[PDB]
Amino acid sequence: TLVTGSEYETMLTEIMSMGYERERVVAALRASGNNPHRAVEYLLTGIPG
Hints:
By secondary structure, the chain is an all-alpha fold. The chain is about 65% helix and about 0% strand. It is classed as dna binding protein.
């Protein structure tokens, strides 16, 4: 499954409704390969490492 550009932006907007800045959410989505479960996990408790 590949999300579209529009779906990526709406995902980013939704995660930003928790208060995170755009660049941080972009970085988390990159680290998680656009899996929102892992992206939010990484915003909450850290990226792998």
